[PDB]
Amino acid sequence: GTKQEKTILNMARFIRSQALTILEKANELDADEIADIAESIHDHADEIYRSALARFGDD
């Protein structure tokens, strides 16, 4: 894949793990709203990661 693609992959992975850290810290505080947003973020970062991999070097 191209440099752009490798950056999207690397960034997507970092966000996924960071969102997971917020999910833990938010629920530790019983901050349900913040947790739900972090969940949505994790879902989007995961989707970017899987979609980018699925199309790796294709274009």
Which residues of this chain interact with Ca ion, rule CB under 5 A? Answer: 30, 46, 55-58
- 1 binds a second copy, rule: CB under 8 A: no
> 26-29 long-range CB contacts below 8 Å, 24 or more apart?
none
Is the Cβ–Cβ distance between 35 and 23 less than 8 Å?
yes
| Dist. CA 43–CA 1, nearest whole Å | 23
- 4 binds a second copy, rule: CB under 8 A: yes
Sites of contact with a second copy (CB under 8 A)? 4-8, 11-12, 14-15, 18-19, 21-22, 25-26, 29, 31, 33-34, 37-38, 40-41, 44-45, 47-48, 51-52, 54
